[PDB]
Amino acid sequence: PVDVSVSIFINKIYGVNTLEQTYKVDGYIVAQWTGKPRKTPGDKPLIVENTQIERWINNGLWVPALEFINVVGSPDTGNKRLMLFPDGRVIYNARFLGSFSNDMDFRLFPFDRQQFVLELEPFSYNNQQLRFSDIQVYTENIDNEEIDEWWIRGKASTHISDIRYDHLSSVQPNQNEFSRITVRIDAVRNPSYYLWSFILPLGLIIAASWSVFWLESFSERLQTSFTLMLTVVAYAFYTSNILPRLPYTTVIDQMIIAGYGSIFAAILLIIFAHHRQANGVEDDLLIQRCRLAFPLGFLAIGCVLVI
Amino acid sequence: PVDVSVSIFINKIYGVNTLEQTYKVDGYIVAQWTGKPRKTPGDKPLIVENTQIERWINNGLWVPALEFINVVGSPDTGNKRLMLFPDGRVIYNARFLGSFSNDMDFRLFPFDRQQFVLELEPFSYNNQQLRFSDIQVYTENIDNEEIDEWWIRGKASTHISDIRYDHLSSVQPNQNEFSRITVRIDAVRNPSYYLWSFILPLGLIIAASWSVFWLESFSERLQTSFTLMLTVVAYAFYTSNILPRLPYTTVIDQMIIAGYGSIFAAILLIIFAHHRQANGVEDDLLIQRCRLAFPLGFLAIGCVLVI
Amino acid sequence: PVDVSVSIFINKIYGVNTLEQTYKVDGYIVAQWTGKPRKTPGDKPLIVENTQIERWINNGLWVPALEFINVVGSPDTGNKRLMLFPDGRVIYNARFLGSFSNDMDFRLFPFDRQQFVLELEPFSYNNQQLRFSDIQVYTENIDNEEIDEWWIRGKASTHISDIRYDHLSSVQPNQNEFSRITVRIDAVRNPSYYLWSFILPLGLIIAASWSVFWLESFSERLQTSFTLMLTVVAYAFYTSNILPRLPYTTVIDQMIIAGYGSIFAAILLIIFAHHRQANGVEDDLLIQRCRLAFPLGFLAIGCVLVI
Amino acid sequence: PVDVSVSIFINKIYGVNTLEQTYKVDGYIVAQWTGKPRKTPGDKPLIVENTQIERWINNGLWVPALEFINVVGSPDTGNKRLMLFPDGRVIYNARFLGSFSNDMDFRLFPFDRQQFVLELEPFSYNNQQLRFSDIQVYTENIDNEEIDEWWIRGKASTHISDIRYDHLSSVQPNQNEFSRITVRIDAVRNPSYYLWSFILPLGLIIAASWSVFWLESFSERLQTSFTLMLTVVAYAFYTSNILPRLPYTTVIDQMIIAGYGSIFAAILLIIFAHHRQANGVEDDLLIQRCRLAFPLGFLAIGCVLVI
Amino acid sequence: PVDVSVSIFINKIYGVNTLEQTYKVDGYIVAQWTGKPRKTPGDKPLIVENTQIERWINNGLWVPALEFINVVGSPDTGNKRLMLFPDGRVIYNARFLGSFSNDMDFRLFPFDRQQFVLELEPFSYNNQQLRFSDIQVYTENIDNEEIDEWWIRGKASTHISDIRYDHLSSVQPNQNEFSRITVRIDAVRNPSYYLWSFILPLGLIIAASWSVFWLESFSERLQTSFTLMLTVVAYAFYTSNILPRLPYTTVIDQMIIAGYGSIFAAILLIIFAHHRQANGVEDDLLIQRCRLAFPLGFLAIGCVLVI
Numbered sequence A, B, C, D, E: 001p002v003d004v005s006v007s008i009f010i011n012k013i014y015g016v017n018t019l020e021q022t023y024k025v026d027g028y029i030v031a032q033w034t035g036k037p038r039k040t041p042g043d044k045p046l047i048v049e050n051t052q053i054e055r056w057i058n059n060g061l062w063v064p065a066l067e068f069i070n071v072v073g074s075p076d077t078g079n080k081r082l083m084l085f086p087d088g089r090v091i092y093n094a095r096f097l098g099s100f101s102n103d104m105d106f107r108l109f110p111f112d113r114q115q116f117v118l119e120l121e122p123f124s125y126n127n128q129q130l131r132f133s134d135i136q137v138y139t140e141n142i143d144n145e146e147i148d149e150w151w152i153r154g155k156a157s158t159h160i161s162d163i164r165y166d167h168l169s170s171v172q173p174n175q176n177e178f179s180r181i182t183v184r185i186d187a188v189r190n191p192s193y194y195l196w197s198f199i200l201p202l203g204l205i206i207a208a209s210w211s212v213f214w215l216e217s218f219s220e221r222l223q224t225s226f227t228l229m230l231t232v233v234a235y236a237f238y239t240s241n242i243l244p245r246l247p248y249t250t251v252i253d254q255m256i257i258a259g260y261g262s263i264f265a266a267i268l269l270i271i272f273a274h275h276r277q278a279n280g281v282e283d284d285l286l287i288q289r290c291r292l293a294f295p296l297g298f299l300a301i302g303c304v305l306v307i
């Protein structure tokens, strides 16, 4: 078994696609192992770059193909190189840009907390012919400032496990364990834009919709309620334009339905408070004491729905 | 005839395009057959990876080209490899990402039920020179949780048939049957987002539009009806933004037209109930008993249109 | 002159881009000619697939390059193969996905009628060195059902003509005619979605906008007319979102301008019918007999604009 | 110096991107020069197609690389070929699709007038080793009809100049002039869609906004003015959706600001005409003679802004 | 150590992506060094173009691979060439189009001020085997006119530093410093479109929203305030459509929240000024002196928020 020593430099993480559950990672990858000694020009290490490699693999050089398990498609490999030392140690340094995929959960959308996973594994050699020895992850480049959409919380967490594939039991018994290296990078979303432009004006609209029970007549209450319902529909549209598509509801999509519920409960209370008549002429004030309590009632419903 | 034994690992299914009727599949494919015995280095199986293959096919190795019948374009083949055993059995394992196409029917859109089909066939060898022996489909990776947009219902259904092409009757008589392997994966859409954000507020808007016959005068009824018609137009827009394009109407696009019909029937009833005058001064109440029945009338029309 | 016999299998036609006037075609293409006799392994025909070909053209095999005249870019050629028979007849079967271009006329948009053209021609050999003999087009796969956006009406129409290029008169006199094969596939758009969701509610909005002359006062008429004008602007937006961009107006964009004209003629008639006063106190009813005639007037204008 | 004779066939021009200032051109390019005599099979000219060429350049054939100066990226070169005549004259015919770039000025947007430029130059050989002799441009295919978005006005204008690069003064004195061929194709935009759907309804909205001074009271004037301001905002949105992004204002974006100015001047005049009171009870009519003059005033401002 | 002399010609800078913080650069790059003397055909310099190079590197020519440190993916390298002089000096001239990345700060969005950075470094050779000698940047092509979205302010600023990598301390002690060349190009956004179409009508809407305290009754004030709140929501949508996505708020997104605050403070003042009653019949005028001061109050708040 050859002991391969990986090191992954993560330059940047971006492009989080919420519907495909993918995200783009750009960085380097440096594998290193020890083979047979060789004679190079002089004593200095020989460096082979890009297209030169395929001239060395045809001459019998052993270079494994380390694939990313959770990549989507194929990484756009830029430069790559092989450094060979007279001692017999080879270093394969390549540069990748990949559209990786994970199982993400956006169910608390502006106050999100995701983790980004990179999985790596030999494509053909099991852990009796190629095993990983360690892994270092360097994420110095990725910053924590207000400008970035994701705050990276702490260093990466690496892991070296042994996956088992039962489907190779028919063609290769007793040797089907593959050595896999995992990398997890935690991240928290930047909730500033979604707190100032989506939560606060929706709160103001819901809080100002309650002040239609101060109007005196009944037709004014109804016409004002219909104007407010058109306002809430236009606001649901404005949030539906500048937002990421999802197959499940976010926090803001609970708040929009809370706005619809407040508007419809106001319309129901208006019709009920008008409709308390003996034959059609008797006015009413009793249920219209809900100018200070039905706000507190639906605010209690919302604060319970938070908890 | 060579007996080829296929196995397809479906990693993920996503990206359903409703207008082109395509969907992206990502996974592996492992074909396996038995050829001539050979002498490899030692007794262990020889592994050829990526670019090495085209150096073996030039030396006369027989590797068939299995194409996907319903793919669109060409799959983005990532890694691939050939494992050759001294016995004489060869294993071709490749990784694909393809934009497959099927005949989908989105006519009940949020409560949809689709099936995803992968068809596979030799590109050149008919079933007298290459026939498939079996196929196993492994879909362990694809989960059924709330987060995924599609729930996969049960395992895949495989099939090995013999397609006949009559157009090769002129150049190759008596041998035109091609062995094809089919794979069907059933799936149901996740209707939660389309039930909470599109059906419920539209139901509330249609139900609150009926309470314009509680207003006393006639001009207030008309102005309120025009405000409600603008509300329904803004709602049709809001659903037209966050939705998949189709050449036929969905369920939600029947509900929008039901909202238009309710608004226009309310306007017609308002004009008719006002217009019952002898010369222009006689008021009316008789047809305005439809504050409790015309709701039930259009609800009966809608519940019949469901059935 | 070599007699080449083409056959084109059209698998699917989709992706009609209205602004670039392109459309994507996916299918096969099978050319066939007769060369020199040869000795193959045994008597059976030898099959060369994919990358093998470029090893045969270097050894002097004559394979012409048939290009698509109206393609945009280069087709994404998938698999391809050459079948050589001891007799001396060669068959070149390839698979293409191309973004073809034509001169389309969307001036009657929902009730459209287009035709899809595929043009094919040798890239270098004129009709004294390579002429086409026939062409069969097989479009069995393309269905006529409600689900498809385009109904294909009848089989394809093929044509073999001889194009003349005068610009080769300076370098190649007397031989500049190139043999071209044309293919036309007629298609009609599916107008169901554009009849139920765009024509009917716009008709209802225009028909309900006429009932503002039933209101009694003058300020109510004006305020209601301005609400209706905002409704028509929101509807023009809703159609502008879910529609294909064009540099000329469709039928629906005549109907939107008809709605604007109806709203503005209603506002003009309202101002004129109020403004018939001797000094400012005299009411009017005479021009307000247009609650039953100005509908018929603008409906006559619309029905004339249809014819 | 070798005399190269270029000829460019422009098949189609489309895809004008207003923000990147690019546009896509699709067509052919035929260069032609005279080298050494050679012996071909027979006397007939030998034709080399596609991949064959790189087998001839390795054998010492001299084929220059003519690059497009203003292209963005690299053209998607389709087929290409070399025709060699026993005399010694070579013809290189290739097919390109490129995303070219120019300096465009959309400051009069619907009534635009652009020109499309193709610049061509040898990549390495200066005008002492390779000079262009002439150029013919054939644009027969591009039509002038209503369907096309751009009307091509007259034939192309070609030019052969000698660019000087001073930065090669350090490595190559006395020889730094490069022979460049320029091609200009004038084009005018089709203003029909932007005249019927954007100028006319905006004119109608501005002209109907002036008739709020016919209302009697003061609160009705203000509420109607606010409804009209919402109408103008919705119209600015409708034009902002179906339009090309720009970093400077168009003609239509002057008309939208003119609509905003008309609405705000109406609100200012309403507040001023109401606010002429001695203590709060005195009515006014004097400044309300602007129902016929303030239309003419802002129309004079607009007609001056045209000139 | 080989002294490499770089020169970068920036043709165009465009395509600024605000969410990925990338931008596209298109231009040339000319490296130049001095190797061993050689014998070329004649005395004139030999020119190798495109695919010829990989035939020279296999024959042992030393051409380094200079990579862009901050590129995303791999540049779309077009043409490239090597000019070799009998003296022994080699010139490598290539053409790139790259999607570069930087740390951009859009926190003052229409009045922005960015800088575009290009970083360049040898991929494998440290500064004991390859060091850069100088760099000239030529940006003559990029203009400062109104048409361009970015005004380039002054020439580029270049820099040659020595980066240290500690992770190579295990495999290469005492030699880990890499010579890097940096290029900065300052740019200012064109704020004309965002000053005429977004700041001025929003200012007019906020300034006209203050004139609801001129209305006499109380229900008219509330209904007008709700119409104005719907106007501000529609305006926030119109700015959210034609704008670049960001994870932090811009200046215009402070102005939208200022509009929401003005509307809600008007509603609060209306409810408070009505609600000053002894039991429900007492009118009020005292707090309604804020028709001239609450404008100045919120304008003072805004002008303080500017400073």
Ligand SMILES: CCCCCCCC/C=C/CCCCCCCC(=O)O[C@H](COC(=O)CCCCCCCCCCCCCCC)COP(=O)(O)OC[C@@H](O)CO
Residues within 6 Å of the ligand: A249, A253, A254, A257, A258, A260, A261, A262, A264, A265, A268, A293, A297, A298, A301, A302, A305, B196
């Ligand atoms: C002083 C006297 C004291 C009297 C005491 C007064 C107390 C009276 C109680 C009122 C109950 C509150 C109802 C008001 C509804 C408030 C709305 C609300 O907060 O609930 C949200 C919206 O619900 C909604 O729109 C639901 C629509 C509401 C429409 C009608 C409102 C209530 C009227 C029904 C009357 C009974 C009918 C009789 C049937 C029993 C739920 O979030 P959502 O679904 O997005 O998340 C799903 C997500 O979890 C999916 O994963």
Ligand SMILES: CCCCCCCC/C=C/CCCCCCCC(=O)O[C@H](COC(=O)CCCCCCCCCCCCCCC)COP(=O)(O)OC[C@@H](O)CO
Residues within 6 Å of the ligand: B249, B253, B254, B257, B258, B260, B261, B262, B264, B265, B268, B293, B297, B298, B301, B302, B305, C196
């Ligand atoms: C106590 C006294 C008892 C009296 C008894 C009272 C009974 C009176 C009956 C009313 C009939 C109901 C009409 C109301 C319309 C309700 C609307 C409705 O439910 O139908 C939907 C919308 O239709 C629509 O908008 C149609 C537009 C409706 C506009 C007018 C409504 C009715 C007024 C016409 C009056 C007669 C005219 C005289 C001509 C005969 C159809 O879905 P849609 O098309 O999307 O699917 C197509 C998809 O299948 C394509 O594949």
Ligand SMILES: CCCCCCCC/C=C/CCCCCCCC(=O)O[C@H](COC(=O)CCCCCCCCCCCCCCC)COP(=O)(O)OC[C@@H](O)CO
Residues within 6 Å of the ligand: C249, C253, C254, C257, C258, C260, C261, C262, C264, C265, C268, C293, C297, C298, C301, C302, C305, D196
């Ligand atoms: C009982 C007494 C009997 C009296 C008799 C009553 C008869 C009175 C006649 C009215 C004429 C009808 C005018 C009403 C306009 C109706 C609107 C209409 O149908 O025409 C469409 C829209 O036009 C429009 O918006 C045009 C805008 C209309 C705005 C004003 C309407 C008429 C008012 C002008 C008054 C005269 C002015 C004085 C000047 C002569 C044209 O489609 P569009 O362009 O999209 O296609 C272009 C496409 O072909 C480009 O390729």
Ligand SMILES: CCCCCCCC/C=C/CCCCCCCC(=O)O[C@H](COC(=O)CCCCCCCCCCCCCCC)COP(=O)(O)OC[C@@H](O)CO
Residues within 6 Å of the ligand: D249, D253, D254, D255, D257, D258, D260, D261, D262, D264, D265, D268, D293, D297, D298, D301, D302, D305, E196
């Ligand atoms: C019978 C008695 C006779 C009395 C005589 C009556 C005469 C009274 C004169 C009125 C002046 C006209 C003002 C009306 C404004 C009309 C609006 C207008 O036409 O101008 C456009 C919009 O301007 C605008 O929105 C500007 C906003 C207008 C808001 C207020 C309107 C006028 C009120 C100010 C009062 C004075 C204030 C006191 C300060 C001196 C300019 O296009 P825009 O910028 O897109 O192009 C920029 C592009 O060139 C960038 O490259």
Ligand SMILES: CCCCCCCC/C=C/CCCCCCCC(=O)O[C@H](COC(=O)CCCCCCCCCCCCCCC)COP(=O)(O)OC[C@@H](O)CO
Residues within 6 Å of the ligand: A196, E249, E253, E254, E255, E257, E258, E260, E261, E262, E264, E265, E268, E293, E297, E298, E301, E302, E305
């Ligand atoms: C003659 C008598 C003299 C009396 C003296 C009169 C003086 C009375 C003082 C009023 C204070 C001004 C409040 C008016 C709010 C004006 C609104 C405003 O200018 O602030 C902006 C919006 O704030 C907002 O919408 C905030 C929402 C405002 C809603 C209510 C307004 C004030 C009502 C609260 C009353 C007290 C409540 C009691 C609790 C203490 C802040 O930008 P934004 O966040 O986008 O940037 C965040 C970015 O920096 C993130 O990086």
